[PDB]
Write a protein that binds this ligand. Structure first.
Ligand SMILES: COc1ccc(S(=O)(=O)N(CC(C)C)C[C@@H](O)[C@H](Cc2ccccc2)NC(=O)O[C@H]2CO[C@H]3O[C@@H]4OCC[C@@H]4[C@H]32)cc1
Lengths: 99, 99
């Protein structure tokens, strides 16, 4: 699709058997989801933005379906105020910014 | 142009006659720029990101060029980790997300 930016570009995602709403975020290197369980090993990470850093769990090789399009990559899980789909998965669904 | 997301979507902006680098950020409602001097009066705003909140100065109707495209609108100035062009100005330059 073509998504305009008059309002937040929120989409439905499927991750870990769950549906969630998430923001398509070109300013995010990484994908960050609110607390949930994921399979496999993880390792700790600090990620930071406006207001500082938060501690997250890094899970690799997670399959996500984003607005209908499947992708695999790393997902960070922790106390983010907004589920954000970052560039590591935006690339995989072929998303671009056009103007 | 068409901007892919394999690398950060950094562009050159011009504000106050000066060139700066900034991130095109569809996950940002507002444009936030590192400390600089802007003309006129400002109003207070608190903005909230991943790691909590920062206080910024809101300047309205500021002339800014983004990747060669002219915009005039609200710029927030404060202790942001990077210069962010948010949706208030992405919509002025006609940006969309496409996949
Ligand atoms: C109302 O107006 C606003 C309100 C909030 C924000 S924001 O900067 O907090 N943010 C909102 C979003 C979290 C809901 C915009 C994001 O695009 C920021 C934009 C951002 C970029 C860099 C640093 C600070 C902020 N990105 C971000 O937090 O990315 C995280 C995840 O991946 C990592 O990549 C980034 O680069 C490495 C660190 C960050 C990490 C901007 C304008």
């Amino acid at each position: 699709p073509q998504i305009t930016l008059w309002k937040q570009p929120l989409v439905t995602i499927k991750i870990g058997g769950q549906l969630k709403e998430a923001l398509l975020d070109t300013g995010a290197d990484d994908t960050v989801i609110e607390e949930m369980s994921l399979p496999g090993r993880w390792k700790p990470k600090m990620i930071g933005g406006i207001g500082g850093f938060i501690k997250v769990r890094q899970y690799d090789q997670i399959i996500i379906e984003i607005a209908g399009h499947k992708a695999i990559g790393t997902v960070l899980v922790g106390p983010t105020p907004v589920n954000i789909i970052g560039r590591n998965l935006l690339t995989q669904i072929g998303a671009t910014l056009n103007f």
